[PDB]
Amino acid sequence: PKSLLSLPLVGSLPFLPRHGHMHNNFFKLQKKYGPIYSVRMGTKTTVIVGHHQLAKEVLIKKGKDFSGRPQMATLDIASNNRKGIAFADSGAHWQLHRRLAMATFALFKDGDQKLEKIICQEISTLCDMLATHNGQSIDISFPVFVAVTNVISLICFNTSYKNGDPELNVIQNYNEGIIDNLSKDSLVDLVPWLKIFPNKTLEKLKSHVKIRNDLLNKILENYKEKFRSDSITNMLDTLMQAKMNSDSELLSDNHILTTIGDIFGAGVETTTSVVKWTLAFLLHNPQVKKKLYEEIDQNVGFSRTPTISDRNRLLLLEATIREVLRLRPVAPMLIPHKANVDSSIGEFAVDKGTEVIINLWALHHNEKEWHQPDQFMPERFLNPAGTQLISPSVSYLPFGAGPRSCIGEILARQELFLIMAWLLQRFDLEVPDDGQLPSLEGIPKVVFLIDSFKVKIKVRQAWREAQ
Amino acid sequence: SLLSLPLVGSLPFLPRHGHMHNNFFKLQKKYGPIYSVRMGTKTTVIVGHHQLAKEVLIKKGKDFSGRPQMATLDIASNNRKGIAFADSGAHWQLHRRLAMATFALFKDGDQKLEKIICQEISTLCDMLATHNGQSIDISFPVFVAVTNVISLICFNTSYKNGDPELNVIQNYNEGIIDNLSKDSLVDLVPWLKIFPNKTLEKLKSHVKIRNDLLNKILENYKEKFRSDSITNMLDTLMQAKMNSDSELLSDNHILTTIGDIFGAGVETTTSVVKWTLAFLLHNPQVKKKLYEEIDQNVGFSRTPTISDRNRLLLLEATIREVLRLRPVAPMLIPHKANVDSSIGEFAVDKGTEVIINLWALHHNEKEWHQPDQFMPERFLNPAGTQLISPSVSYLPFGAGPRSCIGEILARQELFLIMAWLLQRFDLEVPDDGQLPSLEGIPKVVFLIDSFKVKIKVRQAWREAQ
Ligand code: HEM
Ligand code: HEM
Ligand SMILES: [C-]#[N+][C@H](C)[C@@H]1CC[C@@H]2[C@@H]3CC[C@H]4C[C@@H](OC=O)CC[C@]4(C)[C@H]3CC[C@@]21C
Ligand SMILES: [C-]#[N+][C@H](C)[C@@H]1CC[C@@H]2[C@@H]3CC[C@H]4C[C@@H](OC=O)CC[C@]4(C)[C@H]3CC[C@@]21C
C-alpha cells in the first residue's frame, strides 16, 4: 500500500526555544528520556544530568574530570578572556586564584576582623536606614546591595563605602547591565542566536565591563602604594603577596583584577537575590512569618542583637533559608561544567570537551526525594517536634560540590542568617498598601532573580517598648 | 408607539478615557469655548479661550479667586491651610503675601538665588559625571538638587549626600501625587464616594509622615529663631506671628504653608526638567543647536550664569516651548466663584467651580502655528536674535490673584540646570534605543513616564579642564 513520504528533517529540538524556564523544560523531559541525555548544537554536544546519583559522579567522584568550563562569547567578555575563578577553565590560573581566594577567608576567621563583626556592623547600618522609612512601602534591593557590597569590599581591600558615595550607584548600574546582557537562561543557551542575527549584546557587554575594569583598576593602583608585605589582611594583600613571592604569569594585574571582580559580583548579587527571595516567600506565608517572630522573641528577645551563635536557637529561621535555597536556587543549573578528558557518567561515554550541565532544579524538585517539592515548607528541614534541624534528602546541593563548588558558602550562610534575624527582630514586614504580592515565578538569568517588589516597613512595637 | 427612553444622566464623553483636558478641548468644536456640567448639585464651568480665561483670572480675578473644597485636597492641605488649596480669605491672603516677601531676602547678597541654585547644580553635575558612559534615570538627582535649593529658602539648611530623609520625602511625595487625583484635579465623576476604596486612607497615612517630619523641623527651629536674623521663609512666618494676625499664623498653618512651598518647588521643577530632556531626545536637531549656542556664548572658561539668558536665546525659547506643550498644570488649579458674577456675559453663580483649560489655550490652532509640534523657534524672531511672544494665549504660570508665586525661582532653576548640563554632558538615547513617551500622565502634575538617558562627559569640557 503506497504512502506519502515523510519530510526530510534537518533539525530537531524537544521543546520550543524561549518558551518556559530552561531548567524546568529539561526536567520535564526526564519523564520521556531519563535523567541524562544529550543535545547537539552544530559540533558542540551538551549533556544534561538530572539525578543526584549522576550529579555526584560528575561533581565529586569524577570532579577533576568534569571541572572544566566551556568557552562562551559572553563569559569571555565578563571574565576578561577566562580569568578570575567562576568562568576560568580548569588550569593553573584557576587552581591558584581559587586557592588564594579561599585562603583569604582565614584572614577573617576570628579576632577583630571576625566575619560576624564585619557583617553585624553593616547590618546595623542597614537597619538604621530602613527604620527611617517607618510606615512606608519600599524596595529594599539597594539598601541590601550596599550592605553586602561593604562587607565584600572590607574582605577585599579593608575599605568600605560612605552613605551616598555615588560609586555604589555606578556599580549597581554595570552589575545590572552585565546580568541583563550575559544570558537569558541560567547560562544554558541552547541556540546561539547571538551569532545568527545582527545584535549588540556583545557590544553592550563590553561597555559595562569597561566601566567595571576601569573602576577596579583605579583601586588596584591606589593600593600599590598602600601595600605592605608585613600586613596581609584582605584578599588584595593575599594576591599581591603571592605575586611578590613568585607564579607571576598567573598573578598578572588583569588576573588579579578579574579575580577580585568575581568575588565582588558573586558576593553581592547572590546574597542580595536570596534575601529578596526570602522576604517574598514570607509575604506569601504569614503563618511562617508569625512563627519566626515568636521564635526570635523567645530565644533572643530585645536586650541584644542576634549573633551567629543564635543559629543554634533560631532553627525555623535556618530551615527557611534552607527551604528558599531549595526552591529558588541562585543557580538552578549551577555553572556549566566541561569534560577535561574522555570519561563517563553512569557508564555512558562522555568525550573530552563535552559541556555537562547539572540540573539543580530537577534535583531539588524530585518528587521521590521531596514531599510536595513545589511548596514552601520550612518544616521539611526540622524534625517533627521542630527541635532539631535535619537533612530530609541527599538531593540537595544549593552550593554545588567538588572542585568547582562555592568558595563563599560560609560568608553567604552568615550574611543570610544575620540579615534575616536582625530584620525580623526590629521590623514588621507587610504587603504594601496597594496589596500587590511579588511574583514567585522568577527570572532565570546568570542569577535566578525575583522581580522587584515593594514591602511595607514598620518598626515593631515589641522592639520600640524595649527602648 | 415607540418612545425615547427616560434619561436620568448624560455626559458628553466617557469617563477615564483619554486626557480630560483634551476631551474638554475637543468639545469646544461643538459647544463653544465655555460650557458647564452639573454633577449632582455641583456645577462646574470649563473655559477654553484666552479672552475668557483672562476675564476669570485678571479682570475679575478677585471674583474667581476661590478654591473648591475636595476631600482629597482637604487631607493634603490639613483642611485647606497653606496657599494652593486654601480658599480665598484672610489665611490664604496673609501666607501668600509672606511667602512672596520671602523671595526679596534672596534678591541679592551672598544668598542671591543664583548663588544658591548654582551651588546645588554643581553638586548634581559632579554626581552625574560619575555615571560617565551609563544610562540612568536622572529623576532623583534633580529632585535632591531642587529639594536643597528650597530647603535653603525655607530653613537655611540643605541635606548632605546620602541623607535617608530625601528618600523618605520622595516616597510620600510619590504617594500623595499618586493618590491625589487621576486627572488634573478635575475628577468629574466622584468615584471615591460611590464605591468602596482606600484612597483617603492612603493619603492620610502619607500626609501623616509629611506632617510629622515637618513638625520635627519646625519645633527644633523654635530654639534657633532670632528676631534679628530674618533670612528664610520660616523666619518670615515666625516674625509675623511674634509681631501679632496671630490666629492665622498657627503652627499647623505655618507647617502647611511650608509643606506647599516644598511640594510646589520640588515636583514642578523636577517634572519640567524631565520633560525638557525628553523633547531633546526626540529632537536631536534642536539639541545640537543648543550645544552650538552655549559653546559660542559661554564656552568652557566658566560655568553659565543667569546673565547668560541674554545670549542663550534658543535655550530660553526651548524652555518656553516645553511649558507651552506640556504645562505642569494643564487645567491650572480649579478656581471658584466667590460671588455672583459673569464670564463672557453669561451668569455664573457663587460657589460655581470654574476651570481654566490651559491646554486649550496653548493648542489653539488660530493662535499658534502647528501647535502639536515642538518648535522652540516659534519664540524667536525669524533671525534667531531676539525672543518674541508669538501669542497672548500663553499662561504657563497662571495670572491674577492665584498666580504662581515661584515663577522667578522656577525660571532660574530651569534655565541654569539645562545650561550647566548641556555645557558638560552629552545626553543621548540609552543603549537599547528606547525613547521616552511624550504622552504624559495627567496627575496633580502633568508628569512624564520614567525614562533613562545615556550621560557622557563632553570632550570639549574634558579637553578644556
Ligand atoms: C546563597 C548564596 C550562594 C549560593 C546558593 C551559591 C552557589 C554557587 C553555585 C551554585 C556555584 C556554581 C557551582 C558549580 O559550578 O558547581 C558557585 C560558585 C562560586 N561561588 Fe557561590 N553561591 C553563593 C554565594 C557566594 C558568595 C557570598 C561568594 C563570595 C564571597 C561566592 C563565590 C563564588 C565563586 C567565586 C564561585 C566560582 C567558583 C569556581 O568556579 O570555582 N558565592 N556558588
Ligand atoms: C515650571 C515650574 C512652575 C510652574 C509651571 C508653575 C505654575 C503654576 C500654576 C499654573 C499655578 C496655578 C495658577 C492658578 O491656579 O490660577 C501655580 C500656583 C502656585 N505655584 Fe507654581 N509653578 C511652578 C513652580 C513653582 C515653584 C518653584 C513654587 C514655589 C517655590 C510654586 C508655588 C506655587 C504656589 C504656592 C501656587 C499657589 C498660588 C495660590 O493658590 O495662591 N510654583 N503655579
Ligand atoms: C554563586 N554564584 C553564581 C553562579 C556566579 C558567582 C559570580 C558569578 C558572576 C561573576 C561576574 C559578575 C559580574 C557582575 O557585573 C559586573 O561586575 C554581575 C554579576 C556576575 C555576573 C556574577 C553572577 C553570579 C555568578 C555567575
Ligand atoms: C504649580 N504647581 C503645581 C501643579 C501645584 C503647586 C503645589 C501643589 C501641591 C502642594 C502639596 C504637595 C504635597 C506633596 O506630597 C508631600 O509633600 C506632593 C506634591 C504636592 C501635591 C504639590 C503638587 C503640585 C501643585 C498641585
Author numbering:
A (entry chain A): 28 to 273, 283 to 503
B (entry chain B): 30 to 273, 283 to 503
Quote the paper.
Alkyl isonitriles, R—NC, have previously been shown to ligate the heme (haem) iron of cytochromes P450 in both accessible oxidation states (ferrous, Fe2+, and ferric, Fe3+). A crystallographic structure of CYP17A1 with an isonitrile derived from pregnanalone further confirmed the interaction and identified the absolute stereochemistry of the bound species.
The position of the heme-ligating isonitrile of 1 is similar to that of the pyridine nitrogen of abiraterone in those structures. As is typical for CYP17A1 structures, two of the four monomers in the asymmetric unit have a slightly different conformation of the F/G and N-terminal regions. Indeed, a second copy of 1 is bound in this peripheral site. However, in neither conformation does the binding of 20-(R)-1 result in significant changes to the overall protein fold compared to structures with steroidal substrates or other steroidal inhibitors. The structure suggests a possible reason why compounds 2 and 3 with isonitrile functionality at C17 do not ligate the heme iron, while 1 with a C20 isonitrile does (vide supra).
